[PDB]
Amino acid sequence: SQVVRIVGVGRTGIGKLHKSVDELAASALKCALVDANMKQCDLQALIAVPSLASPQFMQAHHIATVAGLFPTKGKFIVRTVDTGGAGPITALGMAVDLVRTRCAETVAVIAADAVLSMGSGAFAERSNASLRRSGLPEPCIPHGYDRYAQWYMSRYGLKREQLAMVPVLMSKMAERHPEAMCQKAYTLDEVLHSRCVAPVTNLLECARRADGAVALIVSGEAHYAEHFAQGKQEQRHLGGSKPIIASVAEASGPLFPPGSSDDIVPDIFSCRHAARDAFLSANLNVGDIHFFGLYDCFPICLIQAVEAVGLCPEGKGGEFMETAYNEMLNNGGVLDPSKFPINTHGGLQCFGAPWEVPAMYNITEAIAQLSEEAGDRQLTPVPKRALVYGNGGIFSASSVAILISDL
Amino acid sequence: SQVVRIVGVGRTGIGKLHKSVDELAASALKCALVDANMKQCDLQALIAVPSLASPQFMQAHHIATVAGLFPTKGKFIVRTVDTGGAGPITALGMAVDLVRTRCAETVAVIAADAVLSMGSGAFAERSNASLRRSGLPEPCIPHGYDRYAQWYMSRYGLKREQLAMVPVLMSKMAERHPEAMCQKAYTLDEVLHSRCVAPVTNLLECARRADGAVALIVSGEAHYAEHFAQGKQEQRHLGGSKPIIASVAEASGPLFPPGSSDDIVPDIFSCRHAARDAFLSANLNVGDIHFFGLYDCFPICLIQAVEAVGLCPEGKGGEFMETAYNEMLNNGGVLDPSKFPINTHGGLQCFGAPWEVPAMYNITEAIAQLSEEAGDRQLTPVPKRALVYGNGGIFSASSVAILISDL
């Protein structure tokens, strides 16, 4: 239709899975089809993102072929897109175009990687190579965000300690999630005393290396209704279970900082414009959103995010974390989801981060919340509308999607 | 707007330039802006394709970053897409899509590579590496197309010499183009004596390694006319040179052929599907098109292409080549463009083929024809409608576009 829903979700476990990137993508897709009450034959498109552990020419075609999608009796469009960690949401928006232009009625979206099984040095060499010509000292990506962090410290008066609060808040959410990689919550002293990786960024502030794959099935509602609407789940929690993609939007910026502190400038950042356009396209505002899946590769990223989507004013993101951190201590060490409805799964900090995959977890957790299937992390009252956010490179790509349970 | 045109075209030379992918791509972008009467500030998006010579994380983002597109006060969307050699046309449809959804007023499309400057061993390993798990012997890609060619011979009655006529016909087109890398046309027996790479594929039947970059600028017609359309060039050839993208369509298939041969089936090929939908979307037929820029990595590809787009019946593409070679011989032999209005620049075989770039040359050659600037290759009367076709992997991706000067 014009109204397009996420009618299928499937994912592997997370951590060190000892499978190839190809095994993961196929396994996740088989799960997603089972979840959608579909078979291989029902797909009319497939979008994927590159893997750092197993980089591959025409990655999506490689996946579709090895998985055994071929031969097929119908038209099947295949694409690979690279916007870094913004990818799974970029691909979500592309899936929307394919349905609305009717080049494909059903679209599978797959992201898969195994950057934990690949090894610490191999990962480091390939990830560092990814930022060649940047002039960033190793490790390059953390140093890139660190440089932006130091800039915020000088410009808005951000404090090292407000940065360090992010993994703590994330660690609290994570221990309520059985699959999250951080099972023991961190102390602020654990984080501040954790190894320095860069001048203002320590080890427990760094994204958590993991293997994992997620497959989504996007389709038109009326289409799904005619052919697949046989499942007998109550329609309450079915709308959130197969949510409407209300809007998707993107904006971008430089791959690496200018290397000159006096060259760093506010309009490099792109998250707000995308969020702004996603809201416009959905005819909604931030006050109608009650779950936020926000990209958090490093603390500076999540801080900029809450400002961007309109949870707090610009420049006040460190304070936003503090008010939640203080309330945590002032609640028996309990981070009340309903007062911090953000990344209830743990995010990249504490749930897991397989390179370009983990923005998918912002989507899967959002659906869990909307369908009242988020367990010990469940927000009350149940959100009807969610916002998800993906970030790529070093504040280089922003992707924002709005998921709503019903119209 | 509703009508979307290619308002800018820029390209480097071709051959062995000994330049980096970033320098090639940037120079192509600089030319395209000059050709479109725009500046960087007027660009609001950028799509690019991966480079084999200098593979780069978030390739499009890297290019835009080094080029100095950033910072920007407005939204600037950047994406990297991978459909192989089908890429530039795939991205073309995406670029129009971006305009029609109003996510971007202007879109740059870039393809750049240096697979000749990269070296024979570097190229051989990576092209072969690109097809791992295919079970194809080295070189992998020629062998893949080789199998499909042999299948054509058994199923449709194609002849070995009819394959070799493709480079002959292309060499004839190539000798009329100052920039084509093959300047002296081949004889049919000459091609057959070239070193074998595969059972039905010789050295001169293989796409010609080259360096080169091409940049296109996509924009809405109503939008462009108001702000940048400054110049008193005749309106005839203004519709040309800045053609309307009438349609874009895609279809896909496996990245590589099966382990047998008798499992190969006509619906593996996707050019037929892509062309039909492109024709449907444009409301035209093959008889309304008077120039064809067709992907010709190997003779079987051009043979399959002409059948697919409806220049000759299914299975009759090799014969189509024979009749053109014969008609040529009883005339010089001089290959008259109007009787074989296909790849007048020389194609991948004899003009050049930098990996994912050369579909850009189908666009530049189509534009040269539509704008009456193709010199000795110039079709008369000036074509009103062109079809361009890009193919990726091993019959893995098809993208087809129809370009018209005016409606």
Coordinates of N, CA and C in Angstrom, one line a residue, chain B residues 41 46 119 134 156 181 232 264 299 311 317 346 361:
Chain B
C41 N 27.5 24.2 -3.3 CA 26.4 24.7 -2.4 C 25.1 24.3 -3.0
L46 N 24.5 13.0 -2.7 CA 25.6 12.3 -3.4 C 25.5 10.8 -3.3
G119 N 47.2 -2.6 -11.3 CA 48.1 -3.7 -11.6 C 47.4 -5.0 -12.0
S134 N 31.7 -19.4 -5.3 CA 31.1 -19.6 -6.6 C 31.5 -21.0 -7.2
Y156 N 19.7 -22.3 -27.7 CA 19.2 -21.5 -28.7 C 19.9 -21.7 -30.1
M181 N 40.0 3.1 -26.2 CA 41.3 2.5 -26.1 C 41.7 1.6 -27.2
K232 N 22.4 30.6 -23.6 CA 21.6 30.7 -24.8 C 22.1 29.6 -25.9
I264 N 20.2 -24.2 -15.5 CA 20.1 -22.8 -16.0 C 18.8 -22.7 -16.8
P299 N 30.6 -10.9 -24.9 CA 29.7 -11.0 -26.0 C 28.3 -11.6 -25.7
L311 N 15.4 -6.3 -29.6 CA 16.0 -5.9 -30.9 C 16.1 -7.1 -31.9
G317 N 20.2 -13.5 -30.8 CA 21.1 -12.4 -30.6 C 22.5 -12.6 -31.3
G346 N 32.1 2.2 -28.2 CA 33.0 1.1 -28.2 C 32.7 0.1 -27.1
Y361 N 29.2 5.3 -19.2 CA 29.6 5.6 -20.6 C 28.4 5.4 -21.5

